[PDB]
Design a protein around this ligand. Structure first.
Ligand SMILES: CC(=O)N[C@@H]1[C@@H](O[C@@H]2OC(C(=O)O)=C[C@H](O)[C@H]2O)[C@@H](OS(=O)(=O)O)[C@@H](CO)O[C@H]1O
Ligand SMILES: [Ca+2]
Length: 474
């Protein structure tokens, strides 16, 4: 039993090493994790920043913001991993040889590997979020599927004013999202208006979404839709239970969310809410623009080994376990005999996952046993296809066939000094954007009056320089 400290959080939950997935990994690797994040910590960014002030770093550092994680490596807080991998991690060594695109995500500008990313199975499923609407509410109200942003507005107004759930109460929440921070709230609200809360590419040049006039229009419209009760009054506070609560209580009319898990609700709620039909639609058009910027990235976050770890060879072997056939299946599918059984060598989920007796969705069940816990593992799209509905599978093809998805801007990497400057500027601007976007949507500030000063604020923090660093690394 080798006691190993780790900082690990995901989706607001500190990693619990007693979950079945990590109990099994413990038996197989003799690595017994001890989290330095405590169970009452739910803000991963503030916990990470606090962790950096505490003196000694944990043996393993996991973080969702890979640019900050790689900066920690450039400063010597994380050790280079490439020699440890070549000598001691045959599964990772093979993975990097077989996947040069993924290897590029792992290599810093100085040539060192400071982190193993948590890879999506990008080359098998590359879409992420889509737009959904309560088709049973459309039929109930005699309305057609809205195809433009303006028609969506009118439709949501009808959802709010005309009692589609039939209980004589003005309780409908026409449009809702799912998030545990402000960035994720904005992410699923501003794409409607063809804006972006982050950096994006136009025509070979990298630009900052929140500084564009499309973002101003998005926020201005959302403030109006907020006042009229068309978007959830609790958008910024409802948290990750939002979709579960609003759909299962028959309150929510439409959303922008991950395709497979959102498609799970039709079967999940079929008995509780007879006729429930939350249906995927193509992104609503705005003046002929039919695109969404929602796309899966090649990876999200990662983990590394800190300079303070006593036994890095043992830890790279732990990293390598998740890239073995058995370790990767464990991370993706859960426990054999509980979450899945092997049928002709291939995992097939059990009733516990696919028809959960406590009314849980399949992915919620998997996360509760420790599967899909973001660290530095390699997702297997067969896990997702194993529980995705037929409508979800058609939905992937629907979005791809109709060419509505724009690829995400890759997470660029920089030389040491530029990488210190960029993350400093990007972090500072992020705080300003999330402050003003909330005030503007909630009605406590006037965006028409304040936009120009906001821009100047971003410029004062270094927006021009950040863009310049961006276009150098592109
Ligand atoms: C790598 C990871 O854990 N990413 C989180 C997302 O997880 C994906 O969600 C779905 C889905 O259908 O919802 C399918 C993909 O296979 C998953 O990897 C997702 O987490 S959650 O929806 O399961 O809670 C999003 C939610 O914001 O968060 C990512 O971190
Ligand atoms: Ca009602």
């Amino acid at each position: 039993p080798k006691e190993t400290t780790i900082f690990a959080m995901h989706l607001g939950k500190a990693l619990d090493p007693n979950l079945p997935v990590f109990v099994k990994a413990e038996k197989d690797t003799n690595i017994k994790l001890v989290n330095v994040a405590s169970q009452n910590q739910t803000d991963q960014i503030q916990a990470y920043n606090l962790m950096l002030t505490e003196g000694k770093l944990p043996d393993i550092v996991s973080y969702e913001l890979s640019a900050d994680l790689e900066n920690l490596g450039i400063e010597g807080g994380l050790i280079p991993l490439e020699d440890l991998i070549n000598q001691h991690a045959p599964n990772l060594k093979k993975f990097f040889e077989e996947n040069p695109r993924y290897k590029k995500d792992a290599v810093a500008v100085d040539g060192h590997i400071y982190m193993i990313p948590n890879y999506y199975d990008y080359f098998n499923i590359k879409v992420s979020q889509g737009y959904f609407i309560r088709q049973d509410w459309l039929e109930k109200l005699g309305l057609k599927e809205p195809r433009t942003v303006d028609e969506l507005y009118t439709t949501l107004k009808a959802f709010r004013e005309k009692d589609p759930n039939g209980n004589g109460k003005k309780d409908e929440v026409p449009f809702f999202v799912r998030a545990n921070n402000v960035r994720k709230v904005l992410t699923s609200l501003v794409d409607l208006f063809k804006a972006s809360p982050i950096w994006y590419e136009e025509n070979g040049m990298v630009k900052y979404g929140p500084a564009q006039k499309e973002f101003k229009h998005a926020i201005k419209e959302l403030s109006k839709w907020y006042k009229e009760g068309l978007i959830d009054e609790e958008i910024f506070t409802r948290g990750l239970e939002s979709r579960d609560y609003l759909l299962s209580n028959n309150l929510g009319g439409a959303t922008d969310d991950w395709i497979a898990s959102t498609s799970s609700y039709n079967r999940n709620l079929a008995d509780k809410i007879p006729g429930f039909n939350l249906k995927l639609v193509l992104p609503y058009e705005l003046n002929g623009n039919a695109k969404t910027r929602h796309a899966r990235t090649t990876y999200l976050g990662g983990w590394g080994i800190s300079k303070d770890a006593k036994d890095p060879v043992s830890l790279i072997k732990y990293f390598d376990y998740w890239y073995s056939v058995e370790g990767r299946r464990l991370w993706n599918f859960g426990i054999e005999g509980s979450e899945y059984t092997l049928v002709d060598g291939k995992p097939v989920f059990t009733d516990k996952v696919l028809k959960n007796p406590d009314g849980k969705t399949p992915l919620a069940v998997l996360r509760e046993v420790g599967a899909q816990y973001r660290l530095g593992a390699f997702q297997d799209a067969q896990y997702e296809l194993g529980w995705a509905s037929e409508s979800a599978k058609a939905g992937y093809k629907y979005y791809m066939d109709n060419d509505v998805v724009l690829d995400e801007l890759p997470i660029l990497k920089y030389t040491k000094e530029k990488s210190k400057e960029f993350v400093s500027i990007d972090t500072a601007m992020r705080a300003v954007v999330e402050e003003k976007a909330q005030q503007w949507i909630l009605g406590s500030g006037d965006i028409d009056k304040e936009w120009d000063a906001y821009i100047k604020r971003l410029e004062n923090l270094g927006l021009s320089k950040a863009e310049q660093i961006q276009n150098e690394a592109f």
